[PDB]
């Protein structure tokens, strides 16, 4: 029961997600061509998220440690309908078998087509992620912990090992803009 709410570029919510998308771009293109920012409204994927959010709160001194983070994966189209699913994690990842996020849109943009075209439209997710007690760096969370924060330039990555601790709130259809 997923319904996509298309946001007007004149809407404060659109501009918020637009600036957050554009301002978090670093260099390893310069700016993005933001085409479509849609809200993801699924009552069951939401009640599943919030239920888990409260579980983590009670295990972390009444602090969910919630963050808005970007996500890229070949599974975006499936995620918005079936929710995040740790079962589809990669066994050999640097931080084990978890779902990867980043606070830089440009980081998540790397993982859109698995692990240089200006024409083909891309999609990222801008998600609510419950980090809870994040371990600074494997199969699951370490004991007493709910997420992994990594920092391998030195760009921050965040990994969860339970699909229900993230909700794909915004679907951003965009292109990387050609440097003039």
Swiss-Prot record:
Main function? Poly-ADP-ribosyltransferase involved in various processes such as Wnt signaling pathway, telomere length and vesicle trafficking. Acts as an activator of the Wnt signaling pathway by mediating poly-ADP-ribosylation of AXIN1 and AXIN2, 2 key components of the beta-catenin destruction complex: poly-ADP-ribosylated target proteins are recognized by RNF146, which mediates their ubiquitination and subsequent degradation. Also mediates poly-ADP-ribosylation of BLZF1 and CASC3, followed by recruitment of RNF146 and subsequent ubiquitination.
Could you give the subunit structure recorded for this chain? Oligomerizes and associates with TNKS. Interacts with the cytoplasmic domain of LNPEP/Otase in SLC2A4/GLUT4-vesicles. Binds to the N-terminus of Grb14 and TRF1 with its ankyrin repeat region. Interacts with HIF1AN. Interacts with RNF146; this interaction leads to ubiquitination and proteasomal degradation. Interacts with NUMA1.
Which pairs of positions does the record mark as disulfide bonds?
A: none
Superkingdom of this entry's organism?
Answer: Eukaryota
- Entry protein name: Poly [ADP-ribose] polymerase tankyrase-2
The PARP catalytic domain covers 8-180
Amino-acid positions noted as binding Zn(2+) in the UniProt annotation, renumbered to this chain: 117, 120
